[PDB]
Amino acid sequence: NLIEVFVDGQSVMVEPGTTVLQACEKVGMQIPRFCYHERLSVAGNCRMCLVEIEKAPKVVAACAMPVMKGWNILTNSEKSKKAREGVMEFLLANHPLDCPICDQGGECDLQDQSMMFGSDRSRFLEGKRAVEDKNIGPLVKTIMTRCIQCTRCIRFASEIAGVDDLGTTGRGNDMQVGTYIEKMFMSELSGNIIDICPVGALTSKPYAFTARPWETRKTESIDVMDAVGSNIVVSTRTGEVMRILPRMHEDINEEWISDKTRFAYDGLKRQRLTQPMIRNEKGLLTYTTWEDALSRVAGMLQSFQGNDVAAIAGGLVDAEALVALKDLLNRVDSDSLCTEEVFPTAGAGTDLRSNYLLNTTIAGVEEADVILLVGTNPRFEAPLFNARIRKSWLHNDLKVALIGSPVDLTYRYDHLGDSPKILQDIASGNHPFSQILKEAKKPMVVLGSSALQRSDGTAILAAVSNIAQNIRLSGDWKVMNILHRIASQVAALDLGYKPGVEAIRKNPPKVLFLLGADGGCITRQDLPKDCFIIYQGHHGDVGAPMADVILPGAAYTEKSATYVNTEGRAQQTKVAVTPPGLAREDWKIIRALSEIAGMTLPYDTLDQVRSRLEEVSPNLVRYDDVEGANYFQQANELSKLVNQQLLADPLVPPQLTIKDFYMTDSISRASQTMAKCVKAVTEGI
Amino acid sequence: LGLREIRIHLCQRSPGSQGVRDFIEKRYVELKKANPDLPILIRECSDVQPKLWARYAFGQEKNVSLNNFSADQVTRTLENVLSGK
Amino acid sequence: PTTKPPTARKYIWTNHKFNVSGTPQQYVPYSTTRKKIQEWVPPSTPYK
Amino acid sequence: TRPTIRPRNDVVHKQLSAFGQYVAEILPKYVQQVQVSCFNELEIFIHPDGVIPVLTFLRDHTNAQFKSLADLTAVDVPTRQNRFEIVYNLLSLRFNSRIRVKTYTDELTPIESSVTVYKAANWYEREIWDMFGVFFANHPDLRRILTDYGFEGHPFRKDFPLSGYVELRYDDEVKRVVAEPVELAQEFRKFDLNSPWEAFPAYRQPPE
Amino acid sequence: TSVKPIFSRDMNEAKRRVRELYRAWYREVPNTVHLFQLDISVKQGRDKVREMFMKNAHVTDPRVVDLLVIKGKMELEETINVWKQRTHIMRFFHETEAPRPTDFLSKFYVGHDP
Amino acid sequence: GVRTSPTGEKVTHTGQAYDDGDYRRVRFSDRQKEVNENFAIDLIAEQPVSEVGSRVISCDGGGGALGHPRVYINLDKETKTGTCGYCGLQFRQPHH
Amino acid sequence: LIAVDEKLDITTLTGVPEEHIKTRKVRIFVPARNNMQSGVNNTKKWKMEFDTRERWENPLMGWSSTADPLSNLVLTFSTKEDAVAFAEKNGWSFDVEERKVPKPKSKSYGANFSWNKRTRVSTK
Ligand SMILES: *P(=O)(O)OCC(C)(C)[C@H](O)C(=O)NCCC(=O)NCCSC(=O)CCCCCCCCCCCCC
Ligand code: SF4
Ligand code: SF4
Ligand code: FES
Ligand SMILES: [Mg+2]
Ligand SMILES: [Zn+2]
């Protein structure tokens, strides 16, 4: 059972195999460290964590030394202090004098630990070394003279990203970390080497020289670039977004964020909508006033009612705006409310959340024994979900099988065909993987929502539900899973939006509200002549060029809002900056439009809007909660009513390359760093 | 008068919602088949009493409490809502 | 300065100027940074 | 010898500890705690209702002739239930010594004025009231001393903004100075300076 | 639950003190107008005193009422002794501040403030 | 490299120039715009490239304690020249 | 020693304007650990901060102007209960976020050299 150790004479009970560093963490002491990271493997080479045992003559490395029974750990001992001073003396003896010209200046673990557990003087009278800088892509700037050879980037690269391209070339004092050849370290998780590097050897190239840590203000929010719902911290200085950093959440993030999340913040400063715009007598877009634009839209809304009113919700819309638009369109008896992504409406459809949620939580992947991925590329659709899958693979020997096109995941997997015919065959039991699933104690079936965009999505959903039913026929564990790639999709489905745009296609509307709809699913060729289009958004990409009235709105960094991720967890984004120019919050715009049109919505403040959200769906106001009910039996019973035949077309994921990963949405398209990344991955260097 | 949407809010681990849970368990499937195009959304509350929200045309809604109801009572309440009485 | 001339530099002013306050040559402050956010220019081609 | 480390006076430390024990024994009804810092400063933590007896004893006792009131101030700690902390610094010329008396008090709890014991307490308590909101029951004249007339709020509380809420300027329309909501041309820049590494292991708190 | 009083043991004594303070302020408005040469009328001063008294009518704790009446007595003492100027007396009357609209549409038009 | 903007206004070394529709140009009417004629980037480009026979060279900016902190530059990569980033000075190893 | 059951409302005594009393939503949270550093000494006390308001640019010199007095106001509390009590007695609206401690992890240096597991590393 638990063993008893002593830290500075204080008794503490720890599990067997616990290290001295973790025992000190238990008692509240933080041992200094340079090479140790709790989410990486143990290295034990920096030697900064040397602590003294009470009667042992030689100090031990706390990061790699399991505790023995009855050991007394002297963290503040004379030997420990001298060892720390010696190690810091070596590190600073070979380190270069680059602190003022270094982006790591005020947030450097070398400086802080030198000032805490180091000497204040130097007796190094020799000359320092200099190392030629490497080039590993447009995202990471390398000044390798500042590297302390802690091998965090190598261990992170290998274990987390599955990319074995970093390593140490050389021997002795001339040992260098690099790729040897001029290969660029490009991945969907490549800024985390910038995060984990304790020194300024690896630094963010877009953020280079812009600011200092003490100036910036930190706003804790969530990431809106996919359905993972990663927690982020936005660093802003003087009302300008300076950078994005990961925020720890051991159920979603686990301290990492994707490169699109980290480096697309500069797309919020380009191609922005700042003032309301209307068509003039020449057919061109000209700036106008909020009163004029809202009066025009209100006149059109009063003129047209019924099924002649459609709303298309994009990928970066929040629950408050969605519910406000839903109420506004319901006030005119209209119901052409839709989201720009397709989900099968047959059977239960959106009536049960378990039918379209990721029922096995992101943290629940680490418990699964077998996972079957259907019609998805999790590496680019949800990089953090793929990282969790790889971690489960590496640690618990998880068996991963992928049905469809052989994408390059960061781990070895069992490939199953390319067509849904094999997917249907597994349900019957002819495939050996049926036996594998039946013998697996913890199976998961993750169907990518990108495979539901084709015309046979309902049949795909029915087949995977049949597979899950066969698995269940053979407690508290959930097998069926759906992985989304759109942040607003889950919130829209919870609020009651109709998936897809097929309803709008079948009943062409006269008034169309494009709320952030930049997917180009519906155009004026599909719409009737003289259709009135109101595009409400923050970036002008497609909807703004095709619109009649353009309403500027706020981004996620600029509004306080609610987003539901792919697993059903609701999280609130906080305000970091204010909308530029005359741009306003989306739900406030909708409320003002309703008031001008004479259909005043019964909420004037964010609290009242969230009360309406609670009335519609309490899970939208229950924050950071993922517990729910599993109505899989009812969902399957309703699904097995109608039968559709799977098409013979292969399951080709929309994203097959990292360039396709880089260019996905409006903010990424407006970014210049993303354009640099695409050019680097296509042309080379 | 024309019904547009039905919402059933039931907490999943409360004694008062036990009757509403039993309706979903073995009576929801039959109801949905008879009303294929009706948005009967089922959600989960936290501590409030179970409720039945009925949204009609032009954004008009009525809420009916389902606290401590049995399975049959929920069926009768839904039948009254569907039939307009 | 005749005995100890100052060090000569290519950027040091050759002509000295007194206080120019209250004169057209007075210093006027201004922001030395570029615009932060670029707006979206609408297309110049009518859609219909 | 250690040139860069301040010397220590064990004799004075022991004398202060002995006097703290002496006063604690003499006044058990009010004295809650006695401390001696490592730089030889004696601190007495007492109940807020024993201020007058403790100060009278420490002023008139033969062995405790602290005739001079050195200072009187308050410290606002929002996390505590009794946020305000009234501190009395007393000086004894007879024995060439200093003592510190501490008292806790919240917003709505009055304290007995010490103007009867020390005369400087008049203006010191006026300043404490003006800057924190702490009320003194038996004060001959309690009113604002430092802040502007009609000023709303107590500036030294930790929840009061640095720049306040209003600012003054001359308005030509009314031919007088007016008060308007504050609006800074350049906002005060808050700097996050605390290091994420513990500097003093001696003051480390339990992990809770 | 149980706390020491300041001046009033219960709400009746607090209300009595409030009435006394109101009487004292009411009897001093014409003198304040005359001494400071204010351009307002006596009725405006009485109405402003009434408004100031009515913005704390929701207070139910006797200690808060005692502190409020103490502060009011302090402010009256400053006015009677002519320690303040015309500046502060007119600062009571928000006169150079633009009228901030309290409707959603106007607040939406002007800016981002709630 | 003082260049004149389309509106007849001098452009500073930071690329600063008010637009045609910017009202803020009124502050320069009947007055002048303070622009420093010497451009540090142009001057440092005009400065030549020092060649030394060593792989690592130390730069302190000249003058000793009156310069910048001493740094060491690795003159291995023959594609470019090693630049001291405090003073922006280029050093190179002989090739031909 | 009188008896009262009020909720300790000092709104009328603080002197804050009613606008900043009733239209402010504060956030009661433990600040997240800065990912650029490995120290955890800044994640031990609860912080109370107000909502961000508008910040425009000065027409002259382009400085960051503001009109929110409580923009730089950050309070430190030892416990969530103390922070919530302070917020309630001051009358501002508030939202509280629970502390997110890092869960304990199993780490073994011998796992890097495994006979038959995937945890074996290809480099040191
Ligand atoms: P009845 O007892 O029902 O009386 C009605 C009220 C509502 C007053 C009750 O007495 C009651 O229950 N009130 C609630 C508690 C209470 O008494 N609150 C009053 C607080 S005392 C107060 O606020 C006095 C301070 C105001 C000072 C005003 C300053 C004068 C400004 C003049 C400016 C211009 C003059 C020239
Ligand atoms: S990495 Fe740290 S120690 Fe090295 S130059 Fe940068 S701030 Fe200084
Ligand atoms: S580059 Fe950074 S993370 Fe990699 S070994 Fe060097 S100091 Fe460590
Ligand atoms: S932290 Fe243990 S040797 Fe590096
Ligand atoms: Mg770094
Ligand atoms: Zn130099």
DSSP string computed for A207-256: TTTS--TTTPEEEEEE--SSSS--EEEEEEETTEEEEEEE---TTTTTT-
F 27-46 near A (Cβ less than 8 A): none
Q: Helix (H) and strand (E) counts for chain A?
A: 22, 26
Residue found under tokens 């699964």 = A368
Instruction: Using an 8 Å CB-CB cutoff, list chain E residues near A591.
Output: 104, 108
- Strand order through the sheet with D84-92: D31-36, D42-46, D97-105, D84-92, D68-76
List the structure tokens of A475.
């407690």
Query: CB–CB of A516/A506 below 8 Å?
Result: no
For residue A196, give the ligand 3 atom closest to its CA. 3
Question: Closest partner residue to A130 among F56, F69, F85, by Cβ?
Answer: F56
DSSP symbol at A66: B
Q: What is the 3-state secondary structure (H, E, C) of chain G?
A: CEECCCCCCCHHHHCCCHHHHHCCEEEEECCCCCCCCCCCCCCCCEEEECCCCCCCECCCCCCECECCHHHCCEEEECCHHHHHHHHHHHCCEEEECCCCCCCCCCCCHHHHCCCCCCCCCCCC
Question: Closest partner residue to A130 among F73, F85, F86, by Cβ?
Answer: F73
Q: Is G61 on the interface with E (CB under 8 A)?
A: no
Task: Give the three-state DSSP class for A342.
Answer: coil
A50 lines ligand 4 (CB under 6 A): no
Distance CA D179, CA F1 (A): 49
Residue type, A152: R
Residue found under tokens 């002297």 = A74
The answer to whether the CB atoms of F14 and C31 lie below 8 A apart is: no
Distance CA A609, CA F86 (A): 54
Task: Give the three-state DSSP class for E69.
Answer: helix
F88 lies in which domain range? 40-92
Residue type, G29: F
Query: CB–CB of A197/A177 below 8 Å?
Result: no
What's the farthest any 2 CA atoms get from each other in chain A?
90
Q: Is C30 on the interface with A (CB under 8 A)?
A: no
E69 lines ligand 1 (CB under 6 A): yes
CA A285 to chain centre: 35
Choose among A8, A510, A129, A463: nearest CA to A300. A510
Distance CA B62, CA A615 (A): 12
List the structure tokens of G23.
């239209």
For residue A198, give the ligand 2 atom closest to its CA. 1
DSSP symbol at F21: T
Choose among A316, G117, A188, A554: nearest CA to E108. A554
Question: Closest partner residue to E64 among G1, G12, G54, by Cβ?
Answer: G12
What's the CA angle centered on A508, arms A277 and A330, to 5 degrees?
A: 75
Q: Specify the pairing of strand A561-564 against strand A549-552.
A: unpaired
Cα Rg, chain C, nearest whole Å: 24
Task: Give the three-state DSSP class for D34.
Answer: strand
List the structure tokens of A342.
């397709």
Between the alpha carbon of residue A325 and those of residues A330, A534, B56, E107, the distances in Å are 8, 12, 17, 20
Between the alpha carbon of residue A385 and those of residues A193, A253, A400, A464, G42, the distances in Å are 18, 9, 13, 20, 29
Q: Is F74 on the interface with A (CB under 8 A)?
A: yes
Q: What's the distance, Cα to Cα, between the start and end of chain D in Å?
A: 40
Closest residue in A to C44 (Cα) is A284
For residue A152, the CA-to-ligand 3 centroid distance in Å is 6
Between the alpha carbon of residue A238 and those of residues A450, A587, D189, D192, F55, the distances in Å are 40, 26, 8, 14, 44
List the structure tokens of F31.
């007055």
Between the alpha carbon of residue C10 and those of residues A57, D149, F35, the distances in Å are 65, 60, 17
**What does the DSSP assignment read for A119-146?**
-S-----SPPP--------SSEEE-GGG
Distance CA A465, CA A473 (A): 12
**What does the DSSP assignment read for A149-194?**
---HHHHHIIIII-----EEES-GGG-EEE-SSS-----TT-THHH
Task: Count the alpha carbons within 13 Å of A484 in the hemisphere toward its beta carbon.
Answer: 32
- Technique employed here was cryo-EM
Q: Helix (H) and strand (E) counts for chain C?
A: 0, 0
State the CB neighbour count (10 A cutoff) for residue F28: 15
Is A280 within any annotated ligand binding site?
no
Is A99 within any annotated ligand binding site?
yes
List the structure tokens of D195.
């290091």
Distance CA A589, CA A542 (A): 21
For atom 8 of ligand 3, the residue with the nearest CA is A150
CA G103 to chain centre: 20
> In angstroms, what is the resolution?
3.1
Instruction: Using an 8 Å CB-CB cutoff, list chain F residues near C30.
Output: 16, 18, 24, 27-28, 33-34
Return the residue in F57, F59, F72 with the most chain A beta carbons within 10 A, the one to mutate for interface testing: F72
Q: Is A30 on the interface with D (CB under 8 A)?
A: yes
Residue type, A143: I
DSSP symbol at A355: G
Distance CA B82, CA C43 (A): 51
Distance CA G107, CA G101 (A): 18
Query: CB–CB of A168/A177 below 8 Å?
Result: yes
Instruction: Using an 8 Å CB-CB cutoff, list chain G residues near A106.
Output: none
- Identify the H or E element spanning A473: helix A457-473
Distance CA A243, CA A194 (A): 13
Query: At what angle are helices A78-94 and A109-117 packed, to 10 degrees?
Result: 140
Per residue in E52-80, is it b (16+ CB within 10 Å) or e — as a string? ebeebeebebbbbbbbbbbbbbebbebbe
For residue A118, the CA-to-ligand 4 centroid distance in Å is 16
Query: CB–CB of D66/D58 below 8 Å?
Result: yes
Query: CB–CB of A142/A185 below 8 Å?
Result: no
The CATH number given to whatever domain includes residue F84 is 2.60.260.40
User: Phi-psi bin for A311: left (phi > 0), alpha (psi -120 to 50), beta?
Assistant: beta
Distance CA F16, CA C31 (A): 8
Per residue in A445-462, is it b (16+ CB within 10 Å) or e — as a string? bbbbbbbbebebbbbbbb
Query: CB–CB of F25/F44 below 8 Å?
Result: no
State the CB neighbour count (10 A cutoff) for residue D137: 12
Query: CB–CB of F69/A142 below 8 Å?
Result: no
List the structure tokens of D110.
């009055």
DSSP symbol at F70: P
List the structure tokens of A406.
């052989």
The answer to whether the CB atoms of E10 and G2 lie below 8 A apart is: yes
Query: CB–CB of A631/A383 below 8 Å?
Result: no
Choose among A438, A440, A441: nearest CA to A426. A438
A152 lines ligand 3 (CB under 6 A): yes
- Identify the H or E element spanning A470: helix A457-473
CA A269 to chain centre: 21
Choose among F66, F63, F59, F64: nearest CA to F88. F59
Choose among A201, A200, A497, A182: nearest CA to A325. A497
Phi, psi of D201 (to 5 degrees): -65, -20
Distance CA A414, CA A371 (A): 10
What's the farthest any 2 CA atoms get from each other in chain F?
58
What's the farthest any 2 CA atoms get from each other in chain E?
50
Classify the C-alpha dihedral D56-D61-D63-D68 as positive or negative: positive
**What does the DSSP assignment read for A12-27?**
EEE-TT-BHHHHHHHH
